[PDB]
Design a protein around this ligand. Structure first.
Ligand SMILES: *[C@@H]1O[C@H](CO)[C@@H](O[C@@H]2O[C@H](CO)[C@@H](O[C@H]3O[C@H](CO)[C@@H](O)[C@H](O)[C@@H]3O)[C@H](O)[C@H]2NC(C)=O)[C@H](O)[C@H]1NC(C)=O
Ligand SMILES: *[C@@H]1O[C@H](CO)[C@@H](O)[C@H](O)[C@H]1NC(C)=O
Lengths: 49, 49
């Protein structure tokens, strides 16, 4: 049971070191914050007539 | 330079602190602009810096 657990924690290191897709639930929050701010700065360019 | 100043260059009135830039403008360009469509570099008409 200890060897299965130690091996399973060993796969978490490798998975997180390897796959680009994993933390997508966090990076899409950082990206929505950044995109909303860049859109709000970009709306300073608009003439509104 | 390095003080806050009510600048005007060529009718570009604004407020800010001026500083010596390292941007490589071409001879045809008088102003550089921000993402916000606001000027953030200028070539002085008295001296080409
Ligand atoms: C319950 O499942 C276990 C797997 O999670 C299993 O453990 C594994 O047992 C095999 C042998 O039966 C081991 O295989 C290695 O055995 C020797 C080296 O020790 C070599 O000759 C083999 O080629 C191979 O490398 C596994 O390493 C071992 N894995 C773990 C995590 O211990 C148990 O045997 C299963 N138990 C029962 C009662 O079925
Ligand atoms: C402004 O005057 C300086 C000399 O004081 C001269 O070097 C410069 O070429 C002049 N600028 C223009 C645009 O004529």
């Amino acid at each position: 049971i200890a060897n299965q657990f130690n091996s399973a924690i060993g796969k978490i290191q490798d998975s997180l070191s390897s796959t680009a897709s994993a933390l997508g639930k966090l990076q899409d929050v950082v990206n929505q914050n950044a995109q909303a701010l860049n859109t709000l700065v970009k709306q300073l360019s608009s003439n509104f007539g | 330079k390095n003080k806050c100043v009510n600048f005007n260059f060529n009718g570009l009135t604004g407020t800010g602190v001026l500083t010596e830039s390292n941007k490589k403008f071409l001879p045809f360009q008088q102003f550089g602009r921000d993402i916000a469509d606001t000027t953030d570099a200028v070539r002085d008409p008295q001296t080409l810096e």
